[PDB]
Amino acid sequence: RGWFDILDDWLKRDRFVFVGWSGILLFPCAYLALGGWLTGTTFVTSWYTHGLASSYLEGCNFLTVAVSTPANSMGHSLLLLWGPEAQGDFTRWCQLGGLWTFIALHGAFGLIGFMLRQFEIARLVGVRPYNAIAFSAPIAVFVSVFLIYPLGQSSWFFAPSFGVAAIFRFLLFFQGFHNWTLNPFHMMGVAGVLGGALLCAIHGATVENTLFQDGEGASTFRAFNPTQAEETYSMVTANRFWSQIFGIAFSNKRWLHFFMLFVPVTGLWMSAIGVVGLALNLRSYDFISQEIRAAEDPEFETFYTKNLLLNEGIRAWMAPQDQPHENFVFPEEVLPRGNAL
Amino acid sequence: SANLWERFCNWVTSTDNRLYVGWFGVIMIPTLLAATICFVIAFIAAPPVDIDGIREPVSGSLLYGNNIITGAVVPSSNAIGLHFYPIWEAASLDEWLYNGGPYQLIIFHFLLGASCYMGRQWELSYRLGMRPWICVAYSAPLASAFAVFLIYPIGQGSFSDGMPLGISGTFNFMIVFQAEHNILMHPFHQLGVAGVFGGALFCAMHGSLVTSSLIRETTETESANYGYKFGQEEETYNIVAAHGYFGRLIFQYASFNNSRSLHFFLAAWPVVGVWFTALGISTMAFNLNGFNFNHSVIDAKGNVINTWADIINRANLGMEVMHERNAHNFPLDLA
Amino acid sequence: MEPNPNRQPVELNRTSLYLGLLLILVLALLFSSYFFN
Amino acid sequence: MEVNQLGLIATALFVLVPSVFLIILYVQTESQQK
């Protein structure tokens, strides 16, 4: 047999872990991304691209370190090591945030390899590849927020930096500038993620309490681990309970386990649409009726106008050192204050 | 008749009712029904509610110019504090509407009814003779509601610090809360986040795996009821690519090799999570805030170096000063 | 013409109507706030 | 406040068109049984 087939069979051998063709893209890209983050939160600075400190070497604890995005003066640069901005010099390349693009691109390729790994395993076992389809929700999220959005703004500077507090900063920046909570697609996302956790808890509890042979000296033994369950309980019991409490229940197990797949996945997809909308700075910030009524009448207050005042504050007090490359300097008689209202 | 009491007890405890109405349910319907009738009337047509006691009101009703997203049931006045304020303690109907009476009616009946829902759950599961523990899994959203509607107000000293019942009202409460207590860096809120993302994730995993393995399902049906043989066919093989990833992570962490630990773990994850954050919201009720770092990095010249924590402190300061009409002389405060 | 041999019927049962109508009417309540502005 | 004359038409069409679509399929498959 030809050399291709020998090679192909050896990639598909029975091992502790399957390598497969998808492994060839998966393992280097994933390992190098993961190591890149590990050496960055441990040695690499951010002192020349944000004026912040985020390294164990600089002295910081687990929550305040990050591998940080490049400057705004780099534009949409790919930041290659051999490219014409670091020109083959390692120290400059770590200092200029080139390690950020390293992680982002290698992690995208790791995600591609992983969905391909799910297909490959599904096809050699011969099951339907539904778990790969489920894994398109993370990919949607990832390519919309770490790649598509910064490619719409002005640089990679507004891309979300890899880090704990660095992502906590993303939340306030979105809350203040775009008013993300008022966007309907994010509303649909919050409902979907909470709905997924809701089905998780309810399923987990009501299968646990309706088992066949919870006493009786259970005389069933197999297991048959791939079934996961879904014969170790009586469906009829479950239905008959829920159909009395909430007044509706499932009666078909297949559609239950498809609804569980459907809900949190659709959630993330709607939010992924929402944030690719923000990339063009197409946001819903306000309702036009409330603004005209509030301009015509200032004895009008709602919880929504209130949100507008708070957002107005977030921006002006965070921006002068969140965005230091803009060189905002704001006197303390122009910064917003509640007691001036 | 058989003298109505005997008929009445059979009627209540019957499980041949289309909707079970237990002895918890007997308290539950009046309370929940009162709560919802008051809620929809108040949401549509409750006149603006003074909430800082200075005679400046806020409109939350729909006939006063809101839509679905900006409307709310506005909480009780700050003057009232934690006083119990039924309608017969007011002296007119218009002043009970001006001080934010109804909000208290709704939440008190809602908490009673939602507790009786848990009771009704436990009772029905006791009648069918099954392991009654659906109720302890529900005790997590219930614990959460106690924490957010009853306890954080008590801790701060007023029901004016409660969560509004409206869409943008919740967003306002969240933002102000982050401003005064720094919830993100509270480890318990982090456990909460982890729990609900992990719940969603395990829901998708479980669903996807199960619907790929099912083949055909059929159970015998009769013209009045159901059968007694539940047929089920599934796939019963898996490979060694879900043995290094699934097999030797789960057999090692579940502490069992048994399939019955799957569904035990599925419910344990988000329930523990929501308990933890429900506990955390209460500890900030007595003002035990989360970690915050200012000036954790200084150079040997004696100049301060900033870090991300300080940027979040700046944004928090920005929100927090905007929230304070009351005075510009405030040094160290709350409660 | 001569009948198409690939002619199959189309189904929709009651519970799908309930679910589907719920989704339509609910989606309207969410986006109507933004249409009216 | 200015509320759109066309916001109402969007609302109206958004509900009425899909609802009558699903309903017609349902009554069609009910006459398929009887």
């Binding site: 007044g247 509706i248 009666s251 | 289309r18 909707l19 929809v40 549509i44 729909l62 006939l63 839509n67 679905i68 049906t221 013209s223 | 049962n13 009651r14 519970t15 309930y18 109508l21 719920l22 009417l25 609910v26 309207a28 309540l29 109507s32 009216f36 | 509320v3 916001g7 109402l8 609302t11 509900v15």
Partner: peptide, 28 residues
């Protein structure tokens, strides 16, 4: 204009609740 539309859509949800409880499809 707007508020009538809001309450009408609400009213038909709660009607749909009633229909799903007391008129479900008999599963045979």
């Amino acid at each position: 204009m707007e508020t009538i539309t809001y309450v009408f859509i609400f009213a038909c949800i709660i009607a749909l609740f009633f229909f799903a409880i007391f008129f479900r499809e008999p599963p045979r």
